[PDB]
Design a protein around this ligand. Structure first.
Ligand SMILES: CCCCCCCCCCCCCCCCCC(=O)OC[C@H](CO[C@@H]1O[C@H](CO[C@H]2O[C@H](CO)[C@H](O)[C@H](O)[C@H]2O)[C@H](O)[C@H](O)[C@H]1O)OC(=O)CCCCCCCCCCCCCCCCC
Ligand SMILES: CCCCCCCCCCCCCCCCCC(=O)OC[C@H](CO[C@@H]1O[C@H](CO[C@H]2O[C@H](CO)[C@H](O)[C@H](O)[C@H]2O)[C@H](O)[C@H](O)[C@H]1O)OC(=O)CCCCCCCCCCCCCCCCC
Ligand code: CLA
Ligand code: CLA
Ligand code: CLA
Ligand code: CLA
Ligand code: CLA
Ligand SMILES: C=Cc1c(C)c2cc3nc(c4c5[nH]c(cc6nc(cc1[nH]2)C(C)=C6CC)c(C)c5C(=O)[C@@H]4C(=O)OC)[C@@H](CCC(=O)OC/C=C(\C)CCC[C@H](C)CCC[C@H](C)CCCC(C)C)[C@@H]3C
Ligand SMILES: CC1=C(/C=C/C(C)=C/C=C/C(C)=C/C=C/C=C(C)/C=C/C=C(C)/C=C/C2=C(C)CCCC2(C)C)C(C)(C)CCC1
Ligand SMILES: CC1=C(/C=C/C(C)=C/C=C/C(C)=C/C=C/C=C(C)/C=C/C=C(C)/C=C/C2=C(C)CCCC2(C)C)C(C)(C)CCC1
Ligand SMILES: CCCCCCCCCCCCCCCCCC(=O)O
Ligand code: OEY
Ligand SMILES: [Cl-]
Ligand SMILES: [Cl-]
Ligand SMILES: [Fe+2]
Lengths: 334, 82, 34, 442, 36, 137, 341
C-alpha cells in the first residue's frame, strides 16, 4: 500500500481496459513517438536525399504525392549506418533533408513492437493462460526487423532499408530481386508456401466449421445468433466435419483432434514466415538465390536458355536502371 | 472406422507383398532407365539431343512461325541437321 | 479375409507404377554428357 | 507425461541420464571439430587463398598463429593435422562417458553422491556449479593470453610488411580502453566491441575477462542468491535453460556482426574481404586505373556533382565516392598508408600507391562477399564460371539463423517455465478460470 | 539541440528504470494461481 | 552442333601456322581458366579494367599480337600493356610473378597452351557473348 | 431400381477413395493434367515454341523445368492432337506446345470435377456446402490467369507456363509490362492472402494457448475427445486477452470462422478481376497527375517515378529473349541504363 506497490499494481492490473504492463511502459511512448512522427512526415516532410547524391525524393502528400506513392523516405546513403538523431543535426532543416525522421520512426517502432511481443507474454501470465501467442507474433516481428534493420546492417546503409510507403515497398522488392534473386531462393519459396498455405488453411478451416454448424436458428436469422458468448457446448459438429473432409480426400488426411488441427493452423504460416524472414536476413549477407544462368549448354558449347536465363534478363533490366545516378563503377557491391 | 480394404501397414510388412514388389519395383526402374539409355525418350517426344539444337554454323532458334505449316517447319529444321 | 484388387488398389498403382518408371528414367539422366 | 517428440524433457529430473546426454553431445561437437578440420586439410591446396576453398576451421587455427608466416602464406600444415586428430580422438572419450552415463550409469546421481547430485531448486548447489564453470571459462580466456604472450603469438594483419605472426608483449590493461569498447555505440563508425582493431586490446580484454570470470566463479561458489534475486527469477531447470538460450542468441547475433565487419580477429587474408572492404577496394581499383591514364582524380566531378573518385563524409573526411560513401568507416592495412589527418591524402594517392596495394585492391574487389546458394560467385545476374561464396557470408548467415531460432527457443522455454512454475502450463482449470472471477471490462 | 539531447536522455533513463525495477518487484508472484 | 576439329583449330603464331587442339585440351584449358583467370575474366571481359577484353579482335590489335597460341603463352609469362610499352608482371598474374600470384606456380608449359587455346576457341562457340558483357547474358 | 440406380449405388459406396458421379469427370482429368505436367517436365522441350530447354532430359532441375506455352503463331488454337496443327502426330504435338493446352483444359475440367465432388460429398453426409463455395476462389484465379488472360492477348504464348521459374518469369513480366503491383485489385488480393495467413496463425495460437486442462499430461493433445460436447478452449479468456492486448476481440465463434472463409476467398476473387483487366492491357499503370508534373519539372521525383524506370529496364532487357517471335533487335546503344552499370 506504499506509493510504489500501488503503481506496480496499476501497471500490471488486469482491470485496465487496455493492459499496460512493464513491457507496455516502454511500448506506449516508443509507439506514440513513431506514430506521430510518421503521420506528420507522411503528410508534410520535405524531400529527402535517400541515396546520398543530392537527388532528393519527394515522399509526402503536400509535396505532390498520393496515398499510393507517398512514403517516409529512408535516410541518406552519406549517413550509412551512423546514428542520426535530431541533436546531431545542425538544424531540423538539415535533419529533414537527410532523412532523419526515418531513423526515429524505425527505431521507436522496432522497440515498441518488440515490447508488444513481450506484452503478449505478460498478459498471458496475468490471466492464467498458456504463453506462446507471442511466439506466433515473432514471425511478423522478425520480418519487420529483417527489412528495417538486418538488411541495412548487411548492406551498410539504412538508405537500403525498406521505405515506409506503398510504392516504396514495391521499389524495395524489385531492387531486392535484381540483387539477390529472392524468387530463386528457397527460403522465400517457403514463405510463399507459408502464406499461400495459411490462406488455404484459413479458408479450409473456416469453411469446414461453417459447413457443420448445428441448426440453432431460422432462415430469417443470421446463423451467428445460434452461438452465445461463453456457452460451454461446441457450436459445430467436428465429426460431421471430419466425415466430409475425410471423404473429400481420404480418412487419414483429415483431423479429428481439434487440438492438433489448431496447432497445425498456428505452425504452418508461423514457420513459413520465420523462413522468409530468415531469407531476407541472410540475403543481407549476400547469400543469394540459386544461380542457374548458362547452366545448360549444348554439345558444341552454345548456351541453351532456360526460364532462369529469362529471369536473369529481367533482373538485369532492374539492376542497370535502379539508382541510375548513384554508381560510378561497374559493380554494385552493396 | 474402416471401409474394408486391407490395412496398408499389414500389406507392406507382409512377406508376399515384398516377394512381388522386390521384382516389380526394380523392373519398372530398369524400364524407365532403358527408355532413356536407349534413346527412345528423345525420338518419342521429339526432344533435341545435345548435338541437335543448332546446325553447326547456326545461332538462330528454329522457331515455329506458322500455325498450319508448323508441322512442316519443324520437319524442315530437322532436315537442316542431316 | 480381405480383397486384393479394389478401387483403392487401382488408384495406388495408377500413381506408383509411373512414378518408379519416371524415377529410373531420371536417374539415367544424371549420366548423360554433352 | 511427455510425448516421444518432447522425449528429452523426460530427463529433467534424471541427473545421471541427463549428464550422459550432455557429455555425448559434447562428443558430437568435438567430433565435428576434428572431422571437419581433417576434411578441410585433405581438400586444402596451399597455392589458393583459404577463402577460395570453402574453409572455416583452418582460418581459425591460422589466426592463432599456427601454420602461417608472413603475409598469411601457409608454411606448415602439420599444426592443422594435429588440431584435427586430437579433437577427433577426444570425441571418443566424451562419447564413451556420455553413452555410459545415458544407458548404463546411475539414472540419478543424488543417491550415488551428494557432490555430483543436484536439485534444480537448490540455489546454493546451482550457483556452485555455475561457479565452477565460470572458473573454467576464465582459464580458457587466459589460454588465449598464454598463446599470444608466451607460446608464439597470433597472426597480426596489421603487422608491418603484409601481416605476420607477432608476439604480444604489452597487452592493453587500461580499463578505460578495455571497457571503453563496451560503452561504444553500436552504430556506424563506432561499432561497439566489433570495432576492436588491434591485438593488444584483444589480449588485454581476455586478461580482464579471465580474471572477472575466476573472480565471479569464486563468488558464486561462496555465496547464495540475495533475496532480491530470489524474487526476480524462476528457479527451475527449464527456466535455467531459457536464460542460457537468450544468452546464446545474443552471442550469435554479435558473432554474425563480428565476422561481417571485423578484419582484425578475422583476417581478410584468411576469410576474404569484408563487404565494406571489397566495395572500398573497387573504388581504389578504378581510381588507380584512371589516374595512370592521366585523370586528376581529385578534381573530377561526377554525374551528381559529387566527386567521381573522392568526396567528403558528413564530418568532412576525404573518402571514396560512388555508392561506397556508406563504407568510409572501413579501415584496413592495405588502405591506411593513404590516410592523412583529414582522410585520404591526395598527395599520397598521386605519388605513393604501391603495386602490392594495387594487387590487393584488385583481389578483394573480385572476391567480394556476394554469391549464390549453389556457390556461383558475384552479383545475382552473373553467369556461371566462378565457384565462390565468401566464408564471411557462410559464417554470417548460418549464425544469424541459429541466433534467431535460439531467441525463439528462449521465448518458448521462458514462457513455459513461468507458466509451469505458476501451475497452468497444461491449461486452464475449468472450475477455477481466472477471467471468470474478474469483473468485465465493460 | 543540447537541451533536447538532455531531455531525451532523461526521459529514456526514467522509463528504462521503471521497466527494470517493475520486473524486480516480485513479478513472478503477479499471476492468478501460485504466488511466490 | 558439336566441338568439331574445325572449331578446335586455332592460330599457332603470326606466321599463320595452326594447331588443332583436342577436346581434352579445350576442356582442360576451360578448367584452368576458371581456376586461375575467371575471377577477373569471367566471360571474356576484365572486371578490373573493362576497356580491355579477351575478344579475338581485341587480342589481334594488341602489341605483340595476342590472337595466337604463342602470343598468349608469352603473355602468360611476361604480360605487357596493350601497346607492349611496359611490363606489368607485378599487377598481372604470370609465371614471371608466380611468387606474388601463387596460383601460377603449378602451371606447366602444356597448361599454358590449353588456357591459350580455350581463350581462342571460346569466341568461336559463343560469338558476341564472349567479351560482350551483360548485354549478352 | 434400374441400371441408373444400381450405378448410383456403386459410385457412392463408402470406400477408401470415394468416387461418386463427380468422380467420372474428376479422376481422368486430374490424373491427365498431373501426368501431362510430369511427362512434359521430364521429357519435353520448349526449343521450337520458346527457344528454351525445359525438361529433366535436357539438363533442367526442378526449379527450371516447365511445360511451356505454345508458340505465339498458334494464336488461341485448342491444339487438339487430331487438329490441323499436329494432325495426329504425337511428337509434333509435344513440340508445338500441345501439352500446355492438354494440361490447362483437363485441369479446368478437373477443378469442375473437384468442386462437384465437394457438393456431392456434402449432400450425402448432410453438411452445408461452404467448402465448395470457398473453392470458387481457386477456380476464379485459375480461369482468369490461365484462360481469360491469354484469350484477351495475342495467343496462349503469354499465359503462365507450368513451371517454378516459368511462373517467376510471369510475375516479373507483369511488373515490367502491366505495373501490376500498382493495381488496387491485386492490393486487395495481397491483403486477402496475407490476411488469411494472419488469421490462420493467430487463431491456431489462440486456441492452443487458451486450452482447458482436460488431462494431466504435458502433451495437451491427448486431452481432446472428438465426441465431447464441451468446447476445448476458453472463448471467454481468449476474448479478454485480445480485448486488452489489441482493443477488440472476437466474441462469436461462428462469425470468427465465417470471417476466416470470407477474407482469403474475397482476396482471391479481387485479384482475378484485376487480371481480367490485364487481359485487355487495362492496367493501373500510371498516375496522370504525376506524369504531367514530372515531365514539366525535372526535379520532381517519387518512388512511383523510380519504379517506372525499373519497368522500362525490365521491358527492354527481357523482351528480345522472352518474345523471340517478334525478332526484336535492340542495339547496345538503345538499351536504357543508368550510370556505370
Ligand atoms: C538486454 C536485452 C537487449 C537490450 C539492448 C537495447 C539496445 C540495443 C541496440 C541494438 C541495435 C544495434 C544496431 C546495430 C547497428 C549496426 O551498425 O550493427 C553492426 C555493429 C557493428 O558496427 C559496425 O562496426 C564496424 C567495426 O569495424 C571497424 O573496425 C574493424 C576492426 O577490424 C574494421 O577495421 C572495419 O573496417 C572498421 O570499420 C564499423 O564501425 C561500422 O561502421 C559499424 O557499422 O555491430 C554491433 O554493434 C554488434 C552487435 C549488434 C547486433 C545487432 C543485431 C541486431 C539483432 C536484432 C535481432 C532481431 C531479432 C528479431 C526479433 C524477433
Ligand atoms: C466460369 C467457370 C469456368 C468453367 C469453364 C470450363 C472451361 C471450358 C473451356 C473453354 C474453352 C475456351 C475456348 C476459347 C478459344 C478462343 O476463344 O479462341 C479465340 C477465337 C478467336 O480466334 C482469335 O482470333 C483473333 C482475331 O481474328 C480475326 O481478326 C484478324 C485481324 O484482322 C483476321 O482478320 C482474322 O482472320 C479474323 O479471324 C486472332 O486471329 C487470334 O490469333 C485467334 O486466336 O475465338 C473463338 O474460338 C471463340 C470466340 C467466341 C467465343 C467467346 C467465348 C470465349 C470464352 C472466353 C471469353 C473470354 C473473353 C476474353 C475477353 C477478355
Ligand atoms: C540448448 C538448446 C536446447 C535444449 C537443450 C532444448 C531442450 C528441450 N526443448 Mg527446446 N528449443 C530450442 C533449444 C533447446 N531446447 C530452440 C533453439 C528452439 C526453437 C526452434 C526450441 C523449441 C522447442 C519446442 C517447440 C519445444 C521444445 C521442447 C524441449 C524439450 C523436449 C525436446 C525434445 O525431446 O526434442 C526431441 C527432438 C526432436 C523432435 C527433433 C527435432 C528436429 C528438428 C526440428 C529438425 C532439425 C533439422 C536440422 C535443421 C537439419 C536438417 C537436415 C536434415 C538432414 C535433418 C527439451 C527440454 C519441447 C518442450 O517444451 O518441452 C518442455 C517443445 O514442445 N523446444
Ligand atoms: C554451422 C556452421 C557451418 C558453416 C558456416 C558451414 C559452411 C560451409 N561448409 Mg560446412 N558443415 C557443417 C557446418 C557448417 N558448414 C556441418 C554441421 C557439417 C556436417 C554435415 C558440414 C559439412 C561440410 C562438408 C562435408 C562440406 C562443407 C562445405 C562447406 C562450405 C560450402 C557450403 C555449401 O555449399 O552449403 C550448401 C547449402 C546447404 C546444404 C544449405 C542447408 C540448409 C539447411 C537445411 C537449413 C537449416 C535449417 C535449420 C538449422 C561452407 C564454407 C563444403 C566445402 O567447401 O568444404 C571445404 C563441403 O564439401 N561442410
Ligand atoms: C544429441 C542428441 C540426443 C541425446 C544425446 C539424447 C539422449 C537421450 N535421450 Mg533423447 N531424443 C533425441 C536426441 C537425443 N537424446 C531426439 C532427436 C529425439 C526424437 C526422437 C529424442 C527422443 C527421446 C525419447 C522419446 C526418449 C529419449 C531418452 C533419452 C535418454 C535415454 C535413452 C535410452 O534409454 O536409450 C536407449 C537406446 C538404446 C539402448 C539404443 C542404442 C543407443 C546408442 C547410444 C546408439 C549410439 C551408439 C554410438 C555410435 C556409440 C559409440 C560408442 C563409443 C562411445 C564407445 C538419453 C540420455 C529417453 C528418456 O528420456 O529416458 C527417460 C526417452 O524416452 N530421447
Ligand atoms: C562433466 C562431465 C562429467 C561429469 C560431471 C561426470 C561425473 C561422474 N562420473 Mg563420468 N565420465 C565422464 C564425464 C563426466 N563424469 C567422461 C568424459 C567419461 C569417459 C572417460 C566418464 C566415465 C565415467 C565412468 C566410467 C564412471 C563415471 C562416474 C562418475 C561419477 C563419479 C566420478 C568420480 O568420482 O570421479 C572423481 C574424479 C576422478 C576419478 C578424477 C578425474 C580427473 C580428470 C580425468 C582430470 C580432469 C579433466 C580435464 C579437466 C578436462 C579434459 C582435458 C582435455 C581438455 C584435454 C560422477 C557422477 C562413475 C559412476 O557414475 O559410477 C556409478 C563411473 O563408474 N564416469
Ligand atoms: C554465466 C555468467 C553468470 C551468471 C549466469 C550469473 C548469475 C547470477 N549472478 Mg553472477 N557474476 C558473474 C557471472 C555470472 N553470474 C561474474 C563473472 C561475476 C563477477 C563480476 C558475477 C558477480 C555477481 C554479483 C556481484 C552478484 C551476482 C548475482 C547473480 C544472480 C543475479 C543476477 C542478476 O540479477 O542479473 C541480472 C542483471 C541485473 C539485475 C543488472 C542489469 C544491468 C546490466 C549490466 C545491463 C546491461 C544490458 C545490456 C543490453 C548489455 C550490453 C552490455 C552492457 C554492459 C553495455 C545470478 C544467479 C547476484 C547474487 O545474488 O549474488 C549471489 C549478485 O549480487 N553475480
Ligand atoms: C499455389 C497455391 C495453391 C495451391 C497449390 C492449392 C492447392 C489446393 N487447394 C485445394 C483446395 C483448396 N484451396 C482452397 C483455398 C485456397 N487455395 C489457395 C492456393 C492454392 N491452393 C488459396 C490462396 C486459397 C484461399 C482462398 C480451398 C477452400 C480448398 C479446398 O477445399 C481444396 C482442398 O481439399 O484443400 C485441401 C486442393 C485442391 C485439390 C484438387 O483440385 O485435386 C484435384 C486436382 C486437379 C483437378 C488438378 C488441377 C490441375 C491444375 C489446375 C493444372 C496443372 C498443374 C500442374 C499439375 C502443376 C504445375 C506446377 C508448376 C506450376 C510449378 C489443393 C491441395
Ligand atoms: C545417448 C543416445 C544417443 C546419443 C548418442 C551420442 C551422441 C553418441 C556419441 C558418441 C561419440 C561422440 C562417438 C565418437 C566416436 C569416435 C571415435 C570412435 C573416434 C575414433 C577415431 C579414430 C579411429 C581415428 C583415426 C585416425 C587417426 C588417429 C589419425 C588420422 C586418420 C584417422 C581418422 C583414421 C542417441 C541420439 C543416438 C539416441 C538415444 C541415446
Ligand atoms: C500426358 C499424356 C498421357 C498421359 C500420361 C500420364 C497419365 C502420365 C503419368 C505420369 C506420372 C504419374 C508420372 C510420375 C512421376 C513422378 C515422379 C518423377 C516423382 C518424383 C518424386 C520425387 C523426386 C520425390 C522425392 C522427395 C523429395 C525430393 C523430398 C521429400 C521426399 C520425397 C521422396 C517426396 C496420355 C498417355 C493420355 C497421352 C497424352 C499425353
Ligand atoms: C577436447 C580436447 C581437444 C583438445 C584440442 C587441443 C589441440 C591443440 C593442438 C596444438 C597444435 C600444436 C602444433 C605443433 C606441432 C606438434
Ligand atoms: O541496390 Mn544496388 O546495391 Ca543495395 O546500393 Mn548498391 O545500389 Mn543502392 O542504394 Mn539502394 O540499392
Ligand atoms: Cl531505384
Ligand atoms: Cl559506385
Ligand atoms: Fe477453429
Amino acid at each position: 500500500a506504499n506509493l510504489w506497490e500501488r503503481f506496480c499494481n496499476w501497471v500490471t492490473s488486469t482491470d485496465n481496459r487496455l493492459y499496460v504492463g512493464w513491457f507496455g511502459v516502454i511500448m506506449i511512448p516508443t509507439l506514440l513517438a513513431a506514430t506521430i512522427c510518421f503521420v506528420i512526415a507522411f503528410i508534410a516532410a520535405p524531400p529527402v536525399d535517400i541515396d546520398g547524391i543530392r537527388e532528393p525524393v519527394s515522399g509526402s502528400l503536400l509535396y505532390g504525392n498520393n496515398i499510393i506513392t507517398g512514403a517516409v523516405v529512408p535516410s541518406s546513403n552519406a549517413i550509412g549506418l551512423h546514428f542520426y538523431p535530431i541533436w546531431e543535426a545542425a538544424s531540423l532543416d538539415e535533419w529533414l533533408y537527410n532523412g532523419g525522421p526515418y531513423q526515429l520512426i524505425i527505431f521507436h517502432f522496432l522497440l515498441g513492437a518488440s515490447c508488444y511481443m513481450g506484452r503478449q507474454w505478460e498478459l498471458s501470465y496475468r490471466l492464467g493462460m498458456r504463453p506462446w501467442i507471442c511466439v506466433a507474433y515473432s514471425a511478423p516481428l522478425a520480418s519487420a526487423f529483417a527489412v528495417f534493420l538486418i538488411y541495412p546492417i548487411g548492406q551498410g546503409s539504412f538508405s537500403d532499408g525498406m521505405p515506409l510507403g506503398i510504392s516504396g515497398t514495391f521499389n524495395f522488392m524489385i531492387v531486392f530481386q535484381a540483387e539477390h534473386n529472392i524468387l530463386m531462393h528457397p527460403f522465400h519459396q517457403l514463405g510463399v508456401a507459408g502464406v499461400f498455405g495459411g490462406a488455404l488453411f484459413c479458408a479450409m478451416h473456416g469453411s469446414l466449421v461453417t459447413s457443420s454448424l448445428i441448426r440453432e436458428t431460422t432462415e430469417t436469422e443470421s446463423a451467428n445468433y445460434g452461438y452465445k458468448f461463453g456457452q460451454e457446448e461446441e457450436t459445430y459438429n467436428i465429426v460431421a466435419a471430419h466425415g466430409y473432409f475425410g471423404r473429400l480426400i481420404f480418412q487419414y488426411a483429415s483431423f479429428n483432434n481439434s487440438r492438433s488441427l489448431h496447432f497445425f493452423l498456428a505452425a504452418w504460416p508461423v514457420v513459413g514466415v520465420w523462413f522468409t524472414a530468415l531469407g531476407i536476413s541472410t540475403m543481407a549477407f549476400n547469400l543469394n538465390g540459386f544461380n542457374f544462368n548458362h547452366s545448360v549448354i549444348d554439345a558444341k558449347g552454345n548456351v541453351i536458355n532456360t526460364w532462369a536465363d529469362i529471369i536473369n534478363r529481367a533482373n538485369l533490366g532492374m539492376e542497370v536502371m535502379h539508382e541510375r545516378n548513384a554508381h560510378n563503377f561497374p559493380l554494385d557491391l552493396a | 472406422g474402416t471401409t474394408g480394404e486391407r490395412p496398408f501397414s499389414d500389406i507392406i510388412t507382409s512377406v508376399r507383398y515384398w516377394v512381388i514388389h522386390s521384382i516389380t519395383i526394380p523392373a519398372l526402374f530398369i524400364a524407365g532407365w532403358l527408355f532413356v539409355s536407349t534413346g527412345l525418350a528423345y525420338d518419342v517426344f521429339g526432344t533435341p539431343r545435345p548435338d541437335s539444337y543448332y546446325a553447326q554454323e547456326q545461332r538462330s532458334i528454329p522457331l515455329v512461325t506458322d500455325r498450319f505449316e508448323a508441322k512442316q517447319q519443324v520437319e524442315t529444321f530437322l532436315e537442316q541437321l542431316k | 479375409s480381405y480383397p486384393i484388387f479394389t478401387v483403392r488398389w487401382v488408384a495406388v498403382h495408377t500413381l506408383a507404377v509411373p512414378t518408379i518408371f519416371f524415377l529410373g528414367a531420371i536417374a539415367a539422366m544424371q549420366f548423360i554428357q554433352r | 507425461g511427455f510425448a516421444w517428440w518432447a522425449g528429452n524433457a523426460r530427463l529433467i529430473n534424471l541427473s545421471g541420464k541427463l549428464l550422459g546426454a550432455h557429455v555425448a553431445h559434447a562428443g558430437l561437437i568435438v567430433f565435428w571439430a576434428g572431422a571437419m578440420t581433417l576434411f578441410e586439410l585433405a581438400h586444402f591446396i596451399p597455392e589458393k587463398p583459404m577463402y577460395e576453398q570453402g574453409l572455416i576451421l583452418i582460418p581459425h587455427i591460422a589466426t592463432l598463429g599456427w601454420g602461417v608466416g608472413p603475409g598469411g602464406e601457409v608454411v606448415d600444415t602439420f599444426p592443422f593435422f594435429v588440431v584435427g586428430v586430437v579433437h577427433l580422438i577426444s570425441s571418443a572419450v566424451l562419447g564413451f562417458g556420455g553413452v555410459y552415463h545415458a544407458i548404463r550409469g546411475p539414472e540419478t546421481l543424488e543417491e550415488y553422491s551428494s557432490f555430483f547430485g543436484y536439485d534444480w531448486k537448490d540455489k546454493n548447489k546451482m550457483t556452485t556449479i555455475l561457479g565452477f564453470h565460470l572458473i573454467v571459462l576464465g582459464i580458457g580466456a587466459l589460454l588465449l593470453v598464454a598463446k599470444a604472450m608466451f607460446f608464439g603469438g597470433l597472426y597480426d594483419t596489421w603487422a608491418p610488411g603484409g601481416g605476420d605472426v607477432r608476439v604480444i608483449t604489452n597487452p592493453t590493461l587500461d580499463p578505460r580502453v578495455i571497457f571503453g569498447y563496451l560503452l561504444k555505440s553500436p552504430f556506424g563508425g563506432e561499432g561497439w566491441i566489433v570495432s576492436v582493431n588491434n591485438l593488444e586490446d584483444v589480449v588485454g580484454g581476455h586478461i580482464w575477462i579471465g580474471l572477472i570470470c575466476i573472480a565471479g566463479g569464486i563468488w558464486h561458489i561462496l555465496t547464495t542468491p540475495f533475496g532480491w534475486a530470489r524474487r526476480a527469477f524462476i528457479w527451475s531447470g527449464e527456466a535455467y535453460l531459457s536464460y542460457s538460450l537468450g544468452a546464446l542468441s545474443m552471442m550469435g547475433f554479435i558473432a554474425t556482426c563480428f565476422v561481417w565487419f571485423n578484419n582484425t580477429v578475422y583476417p581478410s587474408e584468411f576469410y576474404g574481404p569484408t563487404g565494406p572492404e571489397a566495395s572500398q577496394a573497387q573504388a581504389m581499383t578504378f581510381l588507380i586505373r584512371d589516374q595512370k591514364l592521366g585523370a586528376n582524380v581529385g578534381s573530377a566531378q561526377g554525374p551528381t556533382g559529387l566527386g567521381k573518385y573522392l568526396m567528403r563524409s558528413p564530418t568532412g573526411e576525404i573518402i571514396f565516392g560512388g555508392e561506397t560513401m556508406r563504407f568510409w568507416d572501413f579501415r584496413g592495412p592495405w588502405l591506411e598508408p593513404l590516410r592523412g589527418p583529414n582522410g585520404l591524402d591526395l598527395n599520397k594517392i598521386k605519388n605513393d600507391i604501391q603495386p602490392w596495394q594495387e594487387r590487393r585492391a584488385a583481389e578483394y574487389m573480385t572476391h567480394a562477399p556476394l554469391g549464390s546458394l549453389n556457390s556461383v560467385g558475384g552479383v545475382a545476374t552473373e553467369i556461371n564460371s566462378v565457384n565462390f561464396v565468401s566464408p564471411r557470408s557462410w559464417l554470417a548467415t548460418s549464425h544469424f539463423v541459429l541466433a534467431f531460432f535460439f531467441l525463439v527457443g528462449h521465448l518458448w522455454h521462458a514462457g513455459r517455465a513461468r507458466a509451469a512454475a505458476a501451475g497452468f502450463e497444461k491449461g486452464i482449470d475449468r472450475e477455477s478460470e481466472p477471467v471468470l472471477s474478474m469483473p468485465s471490462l465493460d | 539541440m543540447e537541451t533536447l539531447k538532455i531531455t531525451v536522455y532523461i526521459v529514456v533513463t526514467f522509463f528504462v528504470l521503471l521497466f527494470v525495477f517493475g520486473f524486480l518487484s516480485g513479478d513472478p508472484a503477479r499471476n492468478p494461481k501460485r504466488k511466490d | 552442333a558439336e566441338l568439331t576439329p574445325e572449331v578446335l583449330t586455332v592460330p599457332l603464331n603470326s606466321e599463320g601456322k595452326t594447331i588443332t587442339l583436342t577436346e581434352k585440351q579445350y576442356l582442360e584449358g576451360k578448367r584452368l581458366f576458371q581456376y586461375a583467370c575467371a575471377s577477373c575474366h569471367v566471360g571474356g571481359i576484365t572486371k578490373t579494367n573493362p576497356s580491355l577484353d579477351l575478344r579475338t579482335e581485341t587480342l589481334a590489335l594488341a602489341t605483340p599480337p595476342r590472337d595466337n597460341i604463342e602470343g598468349l603463352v608469352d603473355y602468360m609469362k611476361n604480360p605487357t600493356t596493350y601497346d607492349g610499352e611496359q611490363e606489368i608482371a607485378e599487377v598481372h598474374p604470370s609465371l614471371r610473378s608466380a611468387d606474388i600470384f601463387p596460383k601460377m606456380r603449378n602451371l606447366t608449359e602444356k597448361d599454358l597452351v590449353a588456357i591459350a587455346g580455350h581463350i581462342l576457341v571460346e569466341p568461336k562457340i559463343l560469338g558476341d557473348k564472349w567479351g560482350g558483357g551483360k548485354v549478352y547474358y | 431400381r434400374g441400371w441408373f440406380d444400381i450405378l448410383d449405388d456403386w459410385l457412392k459406396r463408402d470406400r477408401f477413395v470415394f468416387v461418386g458421379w463427380s468422380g467420372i469427370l474428376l479422376f481422368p482429368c486430374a490424373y491427365l493434367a498431373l501426368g501431362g505436367w510430369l511427362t512434359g517436365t521430364t521429357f519435353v522441350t520448349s526449343w521450337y515454341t520458346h527457344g528454351l530447354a525445359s525438361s529433366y532430359l535436357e539438363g533442367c532441375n526442378f526449379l527450371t523445368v516447365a511445360v511451356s506455352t505454345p508458340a505465339n503463331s498458334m494464336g488461341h488454337s485448342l491444339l487438339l492432337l487430331w487438329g490441323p496443327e499436329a494432325q495426329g502426330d504425337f511428337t509434333r504435338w509435344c513440340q508445338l506446345g500441345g501439352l500446355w493446352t492438354f494440361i490447362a483444359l483437363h485441369g479446368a475440367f478437373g477443378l469442375i470435377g473437384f468442386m462437384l465432388r465437394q457438393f456431392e460429398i456434402a449432400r450425402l453426409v448432410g453438411v452445408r456446402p461452404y467448402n465448395a463455395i470457398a473453392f470458387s476462389a481457386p477456380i476464379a484465379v485459375f480461369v482468369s490467369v490461365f484462360l481469360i488472360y491469354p484469350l484477351g492477348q495475342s495467343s496462349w504464348f503469354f499465359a503462365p507456363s507450368f513451371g517454378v521459374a516459368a511462373i517467376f518469369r510471369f510475375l516479373l513480366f507483369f511488373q515490367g509490362f502491366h505495373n501490376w503491383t500498382l493495381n488496387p485489385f491485386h492490393m486487395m488480393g495481397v491483403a486477402g492472402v496475407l490476411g488469411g495467413a494472419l488469421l490462420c496463425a493467430i487463431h491456431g495460437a489462440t486456441v492452443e494457448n487458451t486450452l482447458f486442462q482436460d488431462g494431466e499430461g504435458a502433451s495437451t493433445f491427448r486431452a481432446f475427445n472428438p465426441t465431447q460436447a464441451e468446447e476445448t478452449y476458453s472463448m471467454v479468456t481468449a476474448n479478454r486477452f485480445w480485448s486488452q492486448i489489441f482493443g477488440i476481440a472476437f466474441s462469436n465463434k461462428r462469425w470468427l470462422h465465417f470471417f476466416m472463409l470470407f477474407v482469403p476467398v474475397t482476396g482471391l476473387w479481387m485479384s482475378a478481376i484485376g487480371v481480367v483487366g490485364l487481359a485487355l492491357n487495362l492496367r493501373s499503370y500510371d498516375f496522370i497527375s504525376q506524369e504531367i508534373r514530372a515531365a514539366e519539372d525535372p526535379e520532381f521525383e517519387t518512388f512511383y517515378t523510380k519504379n517506372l524506370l525499373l519497368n522500362e529496364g525490365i521491358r527492354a532487357w527481357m523482351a528480345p529473349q522472352d518474345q523471340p517471335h517478334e525478332n526484336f533487335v535492340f542495339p547496345e546503344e538503345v538499351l536504357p541504363r543508368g550510370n556505370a552499370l
